[PDB]
Amino acid sequence: GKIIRTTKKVKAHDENGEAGIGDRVSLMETRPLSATKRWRLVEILEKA
Amino acid sequence: PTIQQLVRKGRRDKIAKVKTAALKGSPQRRGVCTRVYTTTPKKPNSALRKVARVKLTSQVEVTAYIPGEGHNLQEHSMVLVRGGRVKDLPGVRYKIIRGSLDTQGVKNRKQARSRYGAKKEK
Amino acid sequence: TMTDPIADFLTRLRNANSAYHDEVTLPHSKLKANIAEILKREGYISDYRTEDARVGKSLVVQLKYGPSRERSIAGLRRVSKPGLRVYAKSTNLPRVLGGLGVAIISTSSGLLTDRQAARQGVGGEVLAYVW
RNA sequence: AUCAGCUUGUUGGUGGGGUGAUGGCCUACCAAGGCGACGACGGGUAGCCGGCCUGAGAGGGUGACCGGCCACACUGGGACUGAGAUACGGCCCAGACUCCUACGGGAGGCAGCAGUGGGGAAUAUUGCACAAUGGGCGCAAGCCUGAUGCAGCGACGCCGCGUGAGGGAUGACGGCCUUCGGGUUGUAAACCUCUUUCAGCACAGACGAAGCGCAAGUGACGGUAUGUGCAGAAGAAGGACCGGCCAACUACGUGCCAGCAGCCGCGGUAAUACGUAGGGUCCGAGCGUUGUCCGGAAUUACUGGGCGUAAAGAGCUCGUAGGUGGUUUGUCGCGUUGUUCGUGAAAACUCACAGCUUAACUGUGGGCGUGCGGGCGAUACGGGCAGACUAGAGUACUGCAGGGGAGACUGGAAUUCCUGGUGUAGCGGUGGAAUGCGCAGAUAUCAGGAGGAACACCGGUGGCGAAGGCGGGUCUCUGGGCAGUAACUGACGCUGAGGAGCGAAAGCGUGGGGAGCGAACAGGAUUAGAUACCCUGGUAGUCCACGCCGUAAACGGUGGGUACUAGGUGUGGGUUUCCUUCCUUGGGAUCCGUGCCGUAGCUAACGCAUUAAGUACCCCGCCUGGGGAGUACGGCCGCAAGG
RNA sequence: UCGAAGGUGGGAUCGGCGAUUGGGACGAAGUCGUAACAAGGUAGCCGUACCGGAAGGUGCGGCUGGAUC
Ligand SMILES: [Mg+2]
Ligand SMILES: [Mg+2]
Ligand SMILES: [Mg+2]
Ligand SMILES: [Mg+2]
Ligand SMILES: [Mg+2]
Ligand SMILES: [Mg+2]
Ligand SMILES: [Mg+2]
Ligand SMILES: [Mg+2]
Ligand SMILES: [Mg+2]
Ligand SMILES: [Mg+2]
Ligand SMILES: [Mg+2]
Ligand SMILES: [Mg+2]
Ligand SMILES: [Mg+2]
Ligand SMILES: [Mg+2]
Ligand SMILES: [Mg+2]
Ligand SMILES: [Mg+2]
Ligand SMILES: [Mg+2]
Ligand SMILES: [Mg+2]
Ligand SMILES: [Mg+2]
Ligand SMILES: [Mg+2]
Ligand SMILES: [Mg+2]
Ligand SMILES: [Mg+2]
Ligand SMILES: [Mg+2]
Ligand SMILES: [Mg+2]
Ligand SMILES: [Mg+2]
Ligand SMILES: [Mg+2]
Ligand SMILES: [Mg+2]
Ligand SMILES: [Mg+2]
Ligand SMILES: [Mg+2]
Ligand SMILES: [Mg+2]
Ligand SMILES: [Mg+2]
Ligand SMILES: [Mg+2]
Ligand SMILES: [Mg+2]
Ligand SMILES: [Mg+2]
Ligand SMILES: [Mg+2]
Ligand SMILES: [Mg+2]
Ligand SMILES: [Mg+2]
Ligand SMILES: [Mg+2]
Ligand SMILES: [Mg+2]
Ligand SMILES: [Mg+2]
Ligand SMILES: [Mg+2]
Ligand SMILES: [Mg+2]
Ligand SMILES: [Mg+2]
Ligand SMILES: [Mg+2]
Ligand SMILES: [Mg+2]
Ligand SMILES: [Mg+2]
Ligand SMILES: [Mg+2]
Ligand SMILES: [Mg+2]
Ligand SMILES: [Mg+2]
Ligand SMILES: [Mg+2]
Ligand SMILES: [Mg+2]
Ligand SMILES: [Mg+2]
Ligand SMILES: [Mg+2]
Ligand SMILES: [Mg+2]
Ligand SMILES: [Mg+2]
Ligand SMILES: [Mg+2]
Ligand SMILES: [Mg+2]
Ligand SMILES: [Mg+2]
Ligand SMILES: [Mg+2]
Ligand SMILES: [Mg+2]
Ligand SMILES: [Mg+2]
Ligand SMILES: [Mg+2]
Ligand SMILES: [Mg+2]
Ligand SMILES: [Mg+2]
Ligand SMILES: [Mg+2]
Ligand SMILES: [Mg+2]
Ligand SMILES: [Mg+2]
Ligand SMILES: [Mg+2]
Ligand SMILES: [Mg+2]
Ligand SMILES: [Mg+2]
Ligand SMILES: [Mg+2]
Ligand SMILES: [Mg+2]
Ligand SMILES: [Mg+2]
Ligand SMILES: [Mg+2]
Ligand SMILES: [Mg+2]
Ligand SMILES: [Mg+2]
Ligand SMILES: [Mg+2]
Ligand SMILES: [Mg+2]
Ligand SMILES: [Mg+2]
Ligand SMILES: [Mg+2]
Ligand SMILES: [Mg+2]
Ligand SMILES: [Mg+2]
Ligand SMILES: [Mg+2]
Ligand SMILES: [Mg+2]
Ligand SMILES: [Mg+2]
Ligand SMILES: [Mg+2]
Ligand SMILES: [Mg+2]
Ligand SMILES: [Mg+2]
Ligand SMILES: [Mg+2]
Ligand SMILES: [Mg+2]
Ligand SMILES: [Mg+2]
Ligand SMILES: [Mg+2]
Ligand SMILES: [Mg+2]
Ligand SMILES: [Mg+2]
Ligand SMILES: [Mg+2]
Ligand SMILES: [Mg+2]
Ligand SMILES: [Mg+2]
Ligand SMILES: [Mg+2]
Ligand SMILES: [Mg+2]
Ligand SMILES: [Mg+2]
Ligand SMILES: [Mg+2]
Ligand SMILES: [Mg+2]
Ligand SMILES: [Mg+2]
Ligand SMILES: [Mg+2]
């Protein structure tokens, strides 16, 4: 019953490579595009 | 143990020391006895018990204690063996059921008759 | 280090009760203040009032004793702590001392007592059991 | 992790093909990485779920039947057909097995319903029908359906019923004990009356079918279920236990034999524990044994355990990833509760209703269906984000005590040795003596010199260091800690899995040193015996420099940090103030360190007791009966001993 | 082109057996011994090195879970 913090890594698709290291973004699900990726990028809200 | 320790590791439950592993969890096996002889008990008890060496279908060699006061078992005999522990004999974990296959119930039994396999008097 | 003001407050209060003391001075905080407020409202404590110290505000709590000197507080324990944080739904509100104690639950309104919280149907995390 | 790296269409982009649909699904060209200590890749096991058992709950075990999916059809592959293929009784090929042959060649896949052989402890009948319902065909009639309804076998399980009675004696045989008075089986029994359930023998005899047919009928079950009559208590009880745990005792027969047994444990001539009799207990068409699973087991402790001695604090620090934060000054609401509509298949569980005469069985409608989806309404705590202050922490100013560490220089006493006097027959030794050195001049004693180790007093239950540990002086450089002013930083704090650094003595390599001491080894001594304790000698080592191993009862047998909780008596360091000589452990206030005794409290006890084992918070390591065993294998480090 | 089966050759895992050897536990009773528990007749124990049929002895360092004074 104790709260546990866990994280998973999921790889998405971007068309311009506009995302740098240490930024937070929104994601949406899509059709499969290759192995082990099933997502696209929504938009970049902040840049660090 | 603290919360992060429990989260990181988890607690492993105890493992059960299985008894009569030659049965593989199966209550009864049929076996053929190879030799029949006698053994001596430990210090507290002094007697001369009867035990048999039986080849199991599981290809496991194990001792088998013979209950009752009389028996007709000889070498190369069909035996039905159940599981049962004896204290005095060190390495005996099995008891031979009476009244099945080649062994017949010991005579003159009238009390506790079903255990030793005696038919009803008329 | 100093890592849990609420547990420290509860332990200092019950240690003072065990030692038969009368006044305790602690660093002031909103959580300590309103917990003392609900303690005053239920009547397990005598009275509280804030003060000013060399640096910042401090709160003093006066324990309650009767003519026959028996303790007005039986025991305290905290259930929700950093790490193991326990929470209650709207239907599983904890029962303390067979309903004769008090559980402090922070609801949308605030730190409020379990009986009226169940009356409202609201719920949340239980701070401590006081009985 | 006694599995630390994995991968090369692998990862990503572009262009083509591909498929019902997007896609490294396939190809070509570009770049090098993705997944990885919030356990990848490896190894073993296993169909998943609604459910079942246990447990108050948490939880643990599990996947019988039914039902929702998954995968397969002797083993391995491949493809056609079709709206729809792992295509079980479809196809093709390669294997193994079996069968037929006229020898030229062919046919097979019960894990479908039954059945046989083998394994086992063992699990049924080579049964009747489309009457009802689902499924396929056809306009329908109608046809097929081991799906299905039914029957047969088996105390294997949840459930109901039968083997009788009413009265009958201070209690008839016979058995067992006896104290020889008698007591036991016993209202039991023989007896007088009763209804005779269910089987037995007969009659009637269903519903299951507002169903299908434009026909005249249609029920396998079954001539059963169910009613109506006949005769007779007539046909019907056994299994475990009776030493304590655990409701139930006496006698008879052998005595460390024959034997019992779940724990303790019971027989060595007079057993309530062995065997037989009675007697009683429990259960009952079932009775026990055996095996698996839960509970008690708080015996893996989140609720709900400990680490002084029983099992455990790693040797101790620095510190990465993670986990956790000292006040109040500001939005979005991502930890979260704030209400509502919106899913929760069926079945099962729980509540009430209703039907089969009640019984299993099922007949109807609720309710249950403890999780998850979106739209609408909240902001007290529990996080990021958008700004300021400081009670933790650090710095800054002045002082403080200290065997803290390293290098170099230097001092005295003592031992041994050498040299030279003097000086004579013994010196050293133990409970006693002898191996030992002397008459070649010992011991003793004086003078001088040489070399190596260590610093007696101060020196203490005192100081410092994180811990091992640390003390002859002097210099050189340097760490840590403490008090006051509080100038400044303004959430920087804590602990820390894996990782890395330090570390008692002994041990190893290289090269030096080596006075004393002293494993090993010789002798002398004791003892029946000494390969020990004792004596005489003395080789490694003990010292130095560079590396190594990294273990100690490495102890406070107690990890660190923070806040709170009565005192008394000493010590050390520093600030202040006042009797004031202003000398004085004078008196008082304050913080840090270190001894002793003691409250409340805790602990099984001894004991701890503000320097907690007290009451809590944060994180980390360790323990789940004793041997086996801190051992084998495997992995890592070390040249090895070894860890 | 792919493609199952088959054959070449060397690495891992699970194993089964294997002369003989090393170690452990249970028997019961015997010889050799005096180790430890009382200052157990040499205080005990721990780490480590050497030695000896054997329990053990010694060296160095550490603790008192050591008794007297
Ligand atoms: Mg603790
Ligand atoms: Mg019996
Ligand atoms: Mg008996
Ligand atoms: Mg493409
Ligand atoms: Mg496209
Ligand atoms: Mg693709
Ligand atoms: Mg391409
Ligand atoms: Mg479930
Ligand atoms: Mg429970
Ligand atoms: Mg449980
Ligand atoms: Mg399951
Ligand atoms: Mg089904
Ligand atoms: Mg589906
Ligand atoms: Mg196949
Ligand atoms: Mg296949
Ligand atoms: Mg197929
Ligand atoms: Mg078929
Ligand atoms: Mg077939
Ligand atoms: Mg087949
Ligand atoms: Mg079949
Ligand atoms: Mg068979
Ligand atoms: Mg059966
Ligand atoms: Mg039909
Ligand atoms: Mg018609
Ligand atoms: Mg036909
Ligand atoms: Mg037909
Ligand atoms: Mg049937
Ligand atoms: Mg049967
Ligand atoms: Mg039968
Ligand atoms: Mg019945
Ligand atoms: Mg009668
Ligand atoms: Mg009848
Ligand atoms: Mg009809
Ligand atoms: Mg009709
Ligand atoms: Mg009837
Ligand atoms: Mg009894
Ligand atoms: Mg009883
Ligand atoms: Mg007798
Ligand atoms: Mg009886
Ligand atoms: Mg159980
Ligand atoms: Mg807790
Ligand atoms: Mg526990
Ligand atoms: Mg211990
Ligand atoms: Mg330890
Ligand atoms: Mg250790
Ligand atoms: Mg960080
Ligand atoms: Mg919301
Ligand atoms: Mg809603
Ligand atoms: Mg809902
Ligand atoms: Mg329903
Ligand atoms: Mg229930
Ligand atoms: Mg009814
Ligand atoms: Mg229902
Ligand atoms: Mg449940
Ligand atoms: Mg945070
Ligand atoms: Mg300011
Ligand atoms: Mg400061
Ligand atoms: Mg100083
Ligand atoms: Mg140096
Ligand atoms: Mg001389
Ligand atoms: Mg001289
Ligand atoms: Mg020298
Ligand atoms: Mg300022
Ligand atoms: Mg710190
Ligand atoms: Mg840390
Ligand atoms: Mg850290
Ligand atoms: Mg770690
Ligand atoms: Mg670690
Ligand atoms: Mg290093
Ligand atoms: Mg190093
Ligand atoms: Mg040394
Ligand atoms: Mg050394
Ligand atoms: Mg050596
Ligand atoms: Mg060396
Ligand atoms: Mg050398
Ligand atoms: Mg010497
Ligand atoms: Mg010596
Ligand atoms: Mg010699
Ligand atoms: Mg000698
Ligand atoms: Mg150790
Ligand atoms: Mg030490
Ligand atoms: Mg420690
Ligand atoms: Mg602490
Ligand atoms: Mg103090
Ligand atoms: Mg008290
Ligand atoms: Mg007590
Ligand atoms: Mg005390
Ligand atoms: Mg303390
Ligand atoms: Mg404790
Ligand atoms: Mg174990
Ligand atoms: Mg041993
Ligand atoms: Mg061990
Ligand atoms: Mg190995
Ligand atoms: Mg092997
Ligand atoms: Mg072998
Ligand atoms: Mg002897
Ligand atoms: Mg001795
Ligand atoms: Mg001796
Ligand atoms: Mg001794
Ligand atoms: Mg000793
Ligand atoms: Mg040793
Ligand atoms: Mg020696
Ligand atoms: Mg020592
Ligand atoms: Mg002691």
Swiss-Prot record, chain A:
Where do we see the Isoglutamyl lysine isopeptide (Lys-Gln) (interchain with Q-Cter in protein Pup) cross-link in this protein?
Answer: K47
Task: Give start-end of the signal peptide.
Answer: none
Please describe what this protein does. One of the primary rRNA binding proteins, it binds specifically to the 5'-end of 16S ribosomal RNA.
Q: State whether it acts alone or in a complex, and with which partners, per the record.
A: Part of the 30S ribosomal subunit.
Q: Which family does it belong to?
A: Belongs to the universal ribosomal protein uS17 family.
Q: What is the recorded name of this protein?
A: Small ribosomal subunit protein uS17
What organism does this protein naturally occur in?
Mycolicibacterium smegmatis (strain ATCC 700084 / mc(2)155) (Mycobacterium smegmatis)
What does UniProt list as this organism's lineage? Bacteria, Bacillati, Actinomycetota, Actinomycetes, Mycobacteriales
Curated annotation (Swiss-Prot), chain B:
Q: Which SUPFAM superfamilies match?
A: Nucleic acid-binding proteins
The record's region (Disordered) falls at 104-122
What are the entry keywords? Methylation, Ribonucleoprotein, Ribosomal protein, RNA-binding, rRNA-binding, tRNA-binding
Can you tell which superkingdom this protein's organism belongs to? Bacteria
One GO MF term = tRNA binding
Q: Which residues carry this modification: 3-methylthioaspartic acid?
A: D88
Basic residues bias locations: 107-117
Q: Which InterPro entries does its entry note?
A: NA-bd_OB-fold, Ribosomal_uS12, Ribosomal_uS12_bac
Quaternary structure and interacting proteins, as annotated: Part of the 30S ribosomal subunit. Contacts proteins S8 and S17. May interact with IF1 in the 30S initiation complex.
Q: What protein family is recorded? A: Belongs to the universal ribosomal protein uS12 family.
What is the name listed in the Swiss-Prot or TrEMBL entry for this protein? Small ribosomal subunit protein uS12
- Taxonomic classification: Bacteria, Bacillati, Actinomycetota, Actinomycetes, Mycobacteriales
Swiss-Prot record, chain C:
Please name the SUPFAM superfamilies in this protein's record.
Answer: Ribosomal protein S8
> Which of UniProt's keywords are assigned here?
Ribonucleoprotein, Ribosomal protein, RNA-binding, rRNA-binding
- The superkingdom listed in its UniProt entry is Bacteria
One of the record's GO cellular component terms: ribosome
* Pfam short name (any one): Ribosomal_S8
Is Calcium tagged as a keyword?
no
Leader sequence range is none
GO biological process assignments = translation
Q: For this protein, what is any one GO molecular function term? A: structural constituent of ribosome
Q: Which family does it belong to?
A: Belongs to the universal ribosomal protein uS8 family.
Extract the HAMAP family matched here: Ribosomal_uS8_B (MF_01302_B)
Q: What does the record note on quaternary structure? A: Part of the 30S ribosomal subunit. Contacts proteins S5 and S12.
What's this chain's function? One of the primary rRNA binding proteins, it binds directly to 16S rRNA central domain where it helps coordinate assembly of the platform of the 30S subunit.
Q: Report the protein name in the record.
A: Small ribosomal subunit protein uS8
